[PDB]
Design a binder for these strands. Sequence first.
DNA 1: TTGACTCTCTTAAGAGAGTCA
DNA 2: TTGACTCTCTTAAGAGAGTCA
Lengths: 162, 162
Amino acid sequence: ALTNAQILAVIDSWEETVGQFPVITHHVPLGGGLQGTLHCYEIPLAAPYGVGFAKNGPTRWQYKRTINQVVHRWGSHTVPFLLEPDNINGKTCTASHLCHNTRCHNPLHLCWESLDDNKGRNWCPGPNGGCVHAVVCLRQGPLYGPGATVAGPQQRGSHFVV
Amino acid sequence: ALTNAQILAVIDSWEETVGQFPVITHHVPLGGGLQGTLHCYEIPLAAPYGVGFAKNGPTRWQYKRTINQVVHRWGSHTVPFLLEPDNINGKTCTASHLCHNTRCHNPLHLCWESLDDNKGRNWCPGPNGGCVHAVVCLRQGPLYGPGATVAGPQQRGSHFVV
DNA sequence: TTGACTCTCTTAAGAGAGTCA
DNA sequence: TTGACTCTCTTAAGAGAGTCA
Ligand SMILES: [Mn+2]
Ligand SMILES: [Mn+2]
Ligand SMILES: [Zn+2]
Ligand SMILES: [Zn+2]
Ligand SMILES: [Zn+2]
Ligand SMILES: [Zn+2]
């Protein structure tokens, strides 16, 4: 279907449009008790969102372009990765927010990886706290920490050993 | 059922029955290059599973008892925690496998925590690799590691900063 | 060709409830 | 009363596709 040049043109038009989104400065934990700064390019909360963009769910958007009379549509965060393999180890690749900010469309805050890898970043200690992700996290995951477990392992009798 | 005595009786009969499940030894990564040994009490693969137990899904089971002529039914791993709050910070409490082995019903391998805390243990470095869970992990999570990211953050133009 | 809506689906950690014998 | 099946649902990280003007 679309040629390499046409895909590059889609990525370029997407970058042009997203680059004009409001840029919001966020101070974030990096791990190791350190703080850093991320600059998120945030899609608006309500229409209009930007040329080519439309909302398909509370925090889901799509990008649409019509080329040679054919309508093409992509998930709004998948566009930076259109020239990349779309699966790995038999798993579908997903857009994965390193900034953990769904509305952000900054491609410097996205990577392309399995849904399991994606989810796991939520609990990462961060780039200054022990992150071992080969594509390094930009921040400590929002869910990192001791947790809030209500009850631990326990038995009433003597039927079990750990 | 309603009474504390009736609940303790349910827990005691559940422990009785699960204590007769086959005990399967699993050697597991602890983090830090170390290995440990867990003893899982595994529900059978096919019926009959044990008095009071029935399968509602490939890896889902329910425990049922008749009290005051009424049938009471619970998810099979929730029974140890019937006297605990069923929510925390407005999030539902879930049975959470510290051994990451669904068929296991050893209550010494279970805790009671939000679904987010539950999920996050999949990526924990483990009790000898830096686990910070207040209710400590029994093993390194099965998904801990560098990941298999296909593409990292990137831009074609000069519109974005980290 | 374009915008602004609509709908349902995937995954892998977890759930509740009904039908028969 | 107990057993062995059936079905759909929840959550929070992610998706594809239809309708109308
Ligand atoms: Mn993510
Ligand atoms: Mn779990
Ligand atoms: Zn961002
Ligand atoms: Zn990381
Ligand atoms: Zn176990
Ligand atoms: Zn842990």
